[PDB]
Symmetry: D2
Subunit: 329 residues, 4 copies
C-alpha cells in the first residue's frame, strides 16, 4: 500500500462553514487576506483575480505560511467556482485613484468591472454578505445592491469605518489616549464630502464640544477642523508617499469582517441606504453608524446632528446622488 | 485652558518594555511588521529604511489602523535613534535575488549594507536580539555576529524555519493532515543545499522512513524526494509568479519573534554557529534546531543524522565556508 | 416612540439559525473551565449551558454574561430544558459523578451511564447533526455508551480520552529536558486511566528519537527512571484531587484544544477515544485513545501508530480491561 | 552523559521581564490567573496564598495545561520571594461578604490581612504596580497606598471597571447592541453607593438623556434606573445563586492588566485618590475614569457630572471616608 494508507485509516468518506472570499489580489486585497488570516475569522479563504501568475503566486505564498495560521484551506482561481459557499465576499477589485484624482472619477471603470464580478459572486454564494471596498465605495455599494439583487442588509460598503479610525487615531494623538477610548464619527461619503460629527466626539462620555464650544468652527484656536481635513487628505498623503494605501484599509475591513462573522452587533460607520433620513429622498448610499452582524446591517443608529452637521451630510448625499445619475447597467 | 487640560488631569509627566524594530520596509519587512502588530508581541514598533517618502508612508498607513491594534506606539526614521531600547531588531534590508540567481550571490552587496546597518542598530539597542532575515541569511548571520560583537546567543538567522514550514505544508497536503501535526526538519543552508532529515519525519511519533524505506530516495515510487525539491524551488516559483515573496517569510519571522519575546523555549531551525558539530571545524553558521527564548538561542538540539544526511549537511557547511572565508569587513 | 426606536432604525427583526454554537452540559468546575476556555478562544458565536441545579446554573450563566464586554461571543444562554441547546455544532458532556480521592474512574460507570441515558437522547433531539464530545468518566466507556445511545456514526462521537494525559506527559517531558511542551512529543494511549500506555518509541524532540539516544528509556533498569514520568501522568488527577479537591483547568484547556480543531476543521492529530476494532488484534467494539485526525466531521481518520511488541501488549491489555467494563453496561 | 546532555548542547546558563503575581487562589484569584494566561499578558505567573495544599494543587492544575498556553513559567509559594520582580501584583486575598452583607463590613478583616501582605509584596517588587481587588476595594486601595509608600499612580483598585461592564451588558440587552458599542460609566464606590453617569450614556455619540430626559429618574416609563439597581445588586444575586462570583471579575481584572502590561493608555473606571475634585477634601479613593498604562494611572479624566450625579458621588465619597477615617495601621 501507499505510505498514506499504511499510516492512516480513513473513516470518511464536507462544505466549508466560515468561508471568506476576497476578490482582487492587489495590495488592498492582500492586506485584507493577511489580516483576516491572522484574526482566525475563516476556515477557508478564497482568492480571485484576472491575472493568473500573480494570483497563484499570492495563494502559494500564504499557503507556505499555513503552519503559522489556523485557516486550513486556502484556494484561488480566475473561475468563481472556488468562491462557492462563502459567508462573506469582500470586493477589492478595480481601478484606484492617482494623486489628484477623485475616487468619484473611478466610477465607469469600476462599475463595468462590477457587472462581471457581482453576478459571479452571487452565483456561487447567494447567501453571503457582500462587503464592497472598491471605490467610490458608496456608489459601488449601491451598484452591487442593484446588480446582486440582495436585500440591503447583505450589501455593506467599507465606507467611513477607516475615516473614523483615522479620526480616532488623530484624536488620540492630540489627547494622549488610545484611539479605542476616543469616540467620534466621520459619516457620509468616504471621500472629499465626509462629515465630521463634532457633537458626538467624546472621551469617557464627556462631550468635547461641551468642554470646548469652538470645536469644529473656523474660530477654534486649537484648529480641530484640521483633524478632519487630515482625514479627508490621508489617502492622498499616503498615496503621495508610498504610491498606494493597504494596511489601514485591510485592518478596517478585518474589523468589519470580525463583527459580521462572529455576529457581534458592534456599531460601525459603513455604507448603506439612507433614503428617509436627514431629509434625503433618493436611493443614496453613504455611511451612518450601523449595527453589524451575521445578517450584515440589521439596524441603523439615527445619529442626532446639529443643523450644520445635517446640512453637510445632505450635501454629501446630493454630491453622491449626482454621480449616481451617471450609472448605466 | 486647552481642551486636553479641561478634560484630563495629569499625575505623571514621566521607556518601552517590549519594543521591536524592523529595518527595511520592502514587502518582507512590512509583512514582518503587520504580522508582529497582529500577534500583539510589541508595545512599540520602530521601522527604518533609507527611502524617506516610502518609509513615512508605511508608518502612517500602519498608524491609521491603530484603533484595531494593541501596539500604542509606531515610529519610523532614517535615523536609528527611533530604534533605541529595542528587545528585538529584525534585519530585512538588502538586495534580493533575481529569477535563477542564488541567494549566495547577494553576499557582498548585503555585507556592504550590513557594515552601515549593524553598528547603528547595536549603537541604540546594545542588549537586543538580532534576527537576520536578509539573504544569504546563514552567512549574513555570521556577518551580523562579527560586525555587532554580540555573543552567539543574540544573533539569530531566520534560517530554515520557513523551509521546514514549507516542508510540513507539502507533507500535510499529501497526508490530509494539518502541518502542525506533520513533523519534519529541513536543516543547513536556507537555499539550494538544504538537507531534509527524512529520519525525523513523522506523524504522531511514527517514523515514515520506517513505514516506507524508499522515503528520500530517487527510486521511491511515491517520489517523496520531490517534496524537498519543491521546498528548494519554492522561493523561485513564487518569485516567478508574483515577483517576490513576503507573507510566508513574514509569518515565519513573527513565529520566531513570538518565541523570543515570550521566552517560550520552543525549538526552531534557525541559523547559528555549528563549529564543533558533525565534524565542521570552522565558524560556519547554518540551521540546526535551537531552543529560543528571551536570551535568543540558549541551546542547540544535536540532531542525529544518517551518514548521508550528515554528508549533505557537511556539504552545505562547505559551500557556505567557501563563500564566507573570501569576505572582508 | 421608545428610546430604542428613537435611537435605532431596524432593517431585520429576523434571526438566523445558530452558526457556531457550542453546548456544554454540566456546570461543575470542569464544565465551567471548558466554558471559560472556549469563550476566550473565540470558538463560538453562541454558548449554551445545561445542568439540573437551577440556581447554580443561572448564576454561572449570569457571571459569564457580566464579562461580555471582554469577550467576543455575543449569545450566552442556559436552561434545564434542552431546547436551549438546539442547533449545536458541538455538544460537550461534562455531567456526572467524579472520583473521590483514591477512587477509580471505572467506578463511576453505573452512575454516569444512568445519567447519560437521560442526557444523550435529549441532546440528540435538539442537535441531531452535532458532534458529541464526551468528557465525563470513564470517558472511553462513556464514549461507547454515547455512541450506542445516540445512533450517531462513530466519527461524530469523540471521547476527550488521552489528550490531557498526553499534555501532562509532554509537560513533564518539558521540565526534564528544558523545552516547551509544544516542542516535546510523546503519546500516552489506551485508557484515560491506570491502564494508559506510554509510547516510548515515538518520544522525540525535533524528530530525534529519545529511545534511540537512551535505549533503556521506559524500562525498569533506566537509570533516569523515565517510567516514573508515566506514573506521574497516571497519578496526576489523584495528586491534584488530594491537594485542591478536584481538577478543572488542565481538562478545560484540553477540551478547548479539541473543540478548536473540530470547530475550525483543522485536521490536527489528537489522542481521543474512538472505536479501534480491527487494529492491533482487537476484534470487539472497544473504545480507547489512538491518534485521530479531528475536523468538522469529528474523527475523519485514525493514525495507525506502530508499537513495539511490549507497547502493543499493554494497549491490548488496556483494551481488554475496557472491554471488561463494557460488559457491565445494560441498555 | 544524561539523555538531556546527549540531546541538547547548552550555549548559555535572567530576570523576569513581564511577570504578574496573583495573591489569593480562591475563585477570584484563579479566574484572574486563567484570564491572564489565556490573554498572553505574562511571561511568568506567580501565585501566593496561605493554604499550602490548595496553592500547590492550583499551580499543578495550571501547569498541566501548559502545552495549551504561551506562559512558560508558573510558580507559587507561601513565601513572597516567588513574587520577586513582578511588574504587576494583583491582590485578591481576604474575607468576602455573605449574601446580604455589604462589602464595607469586610474592612477590618481585610485591612488586618493587608498589613501582612502589602509590605511582603513591596519588599520583593518595589517597582511593581499594585492592583487591589479585595473588598471594600476603594478603602483597601487607600490602605495599600498608605502601607506601601508607593506613589499613587502605582496603586490601582479594580473599582468600578466591573460595575461599568455590567452596566454596558445590561444596556446592550435593552438596545440590541454589543456592550463594546454601548457606553456609560458607573463611578464612585464599588458597592451600594455607586453613581450611574446618565449624562454620559450613549451609543455612537448620541446622548440617551438628550433623547429621553426621564432617563435615570424614578418616573421614567422605561425604568432605566433599574439598570443601575441591577448593577448594584449583581454580586448579591450571583452570590445567592452560585455562592460566589468569579468570572466577570476575573475578566475585568485581566482587562485592566492588559492595559497596564501593554501600556495601552485606555480609559477605565478604577479606584484612585480624588481629593480636590467634586469638592472632596479628604484622601478618599474611589472610581473615576483613569488612563492606564505601564506606570499605572498616569492621568484622570475629569468627567462633567450633573448636579445630582455630583451629589450622588459626593455621597459615595462621604460613606467611604466615614470608614477610612476610623482605621489605624
Ligand atoms: C473583470 C475583472 N475582474 C477582476 C477581478 C480582480 C481584479 N483585480 C484588481 O483589480 C486588483 C487591483 N485593484 C486594486 O487593488 C484596487 C484597490 C482599491 C482600493 C484602494 C485603496 C482603498 C483605501 C484608500 C482609499 O479609499 O482611497 C484609503 O482611504 O486609504 C480602497 C480601495 C480585477 C478585475 S477586472
Ligand atoms: C545602507 C542601507 N541601509 C538600508 C536600510 C534599509 C534598506 N531597505 C531595503 O533594502 C528594503 C528592500 N529590500 C528588501 O526588502 C529585501 C528582502 C530580502 C528577502 C526577501 C525574501 C526572503 C524570503 C525568500 C527568500 O529567502 O528568498 C523565501 O524563501 O520566500 C528573505 C529576504 C536598504 C538599506 S541600504
Ligand atoms: C440527569 C442529569 N442531567 C445532568 C446534567 C448536568 C449535571 N451536572 C453535573 O453533574 C455537574 C457536576 N459534574 C461534574 O462536573 C463531573 C465532571 C467529570 C470530570 C472530572 C474531571 C475530569 C478530569 C480529570 C479526570 O479525568 O479524572 C483529570 O484527569 O484531571 C474529567 C471529567 C448533572 C446531571 S444529572
Ligand atoms: C495573611 C494572609 N495572607 C493571605 C494570602 C492569601 C489568602 N487567600 C485568600 O483569602 C483567598 C480567598 N479570598 C478570596 O478569594 C477573596 C475574594 C475577594 C473578592 C470577591 C469578589 C469580588 C467581585 C464581586 C464583589 O465585589 O463582591 C463582584 O462584584 O462580583 C472581588 C473580590 C489569605 C491570606 S491571609
Amino acid at each position: 500500500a501507499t505510505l498514506k494508507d499504511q499510516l492512516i485509516y480513513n473513516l470518511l468518506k464536507q462544505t466549508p462553514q466560515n468561508k471568506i472570499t476576497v476578490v482582487g489580489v492587489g495590495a488592498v486585497g492582500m492586506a485584507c487576506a493577511i489580516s483576516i488570516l491572522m484574526k482566525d475569522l475563516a476556515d477557508e479563504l478564497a482568492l480571485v483575480d484576472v491575472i493568473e501568475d500573480k494570483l497563484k503566486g499570492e495563494m502559494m505564498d500564504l499557503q507556505h505560511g499555513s503552519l503559522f495560521l489556523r485557516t486550513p484551506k486556502i484556494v484561488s482561481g480566475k473561475d468563481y467556482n472556488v468562491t462557492a459557499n462563502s459567508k462573506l465576499v469582500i470586493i477589492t477589485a478595480g481601478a484606484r485613484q492617482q494623486e489628484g484624482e477623485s475616487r468619484l472619477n473611478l466610477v465607469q471603470r469600476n462599475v463595468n468591472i462590477f457587472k462581471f464580478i457581482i453576478p459571479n459572486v452571487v452565483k456561487y454564494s447567494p447567501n453571503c454578505k457582500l462587503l464592497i471596498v472598491s471605490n467610490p465605495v458608496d456608489i459601488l455599494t449601491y451598484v452591487a445592491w442593484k446588480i446582486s439583487g440582495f436585500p440591503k442588509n447583505r450589501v455593506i460598503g467599507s465606507g467611513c469605518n477607516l475615516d473614523s479610525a483615522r479620526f480616532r487615531y488623530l484624536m488620540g494623538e492630540r489627547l494622549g489616549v488610545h484611539p479605542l477610548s476616543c469616540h467620534g464619527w466621520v459619516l457620509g461619503e468616504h471621500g472629499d464630502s465626509s462629515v465630521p460629527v463634532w457633537s458626538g466626539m467624546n472621551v469617557a462620555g464627556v462631550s468635547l464640544k461641551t468642554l470646548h464650544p469652538d470645536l469644529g468652527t473656523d474660530k477654534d484656536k486649537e484648529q480641530w477642523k484640521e483633524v478632519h481635513k487630515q482625514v479627508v487628505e490621508s489617502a492622498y498623503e499616503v498615496i503621495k508617499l508610498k504610491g498606494y494605501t493597504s494596511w489601514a484599509i485591510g485592518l478596517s475591513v478585518a474589523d468589519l469582517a470580525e463583527s459580521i462573522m462572529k455576529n457581534l452587533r458592534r456599531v460601525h460607520p459603513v455604507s448603506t441606504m439612507i433614503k428617509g433620513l436627514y431629509g434625503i429622498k433618493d436611493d443614496v448610499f453613504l455611511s451612518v453608524p450601523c449595527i453589524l452582524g451575521q445578517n450584515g446591517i440589521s439596524d441603523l443608529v439615527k445619529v442626532t446632528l446639529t443643523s450644520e452637521e445635517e446640512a453637510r451630510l445632505k450635501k454629501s448625499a446630493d454630491t453622491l446622488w449626482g454621480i449616481q445619475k451617471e450609472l448605466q447597467f
